[PDB]
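Follow-up to my post from last week.
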Amino acid sequence: AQFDILLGTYCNTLNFVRFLELGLSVACICTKFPELAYVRDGVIQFEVQ
Amino acid sequence: AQFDILLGTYCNTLNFVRFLELGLSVACICTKFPELAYVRDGVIQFEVQ
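User reply:
Got it. Predicted complex:
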């Protein structure tokens, strides 16, 4: 009465990372812009006295 | 008179150990299996992403 037995399957669950909860999120100012593919150039100006 | 005397017999008893009460029992997950001599090959499985 020889027989093979399966004793169980183990599968891990991935943990998802949100960017805001990282400490690196304080080094940038994120902002959404859907029409970014149409942008030729983008100008940002400074006036320092 | 000239008698001989026996001044007592000393006998010790054993100290029984159980495997679970040892701290080594934490490193295994014991399970009874009466039909173990009939097992030809047992397998475990993993699915890791």
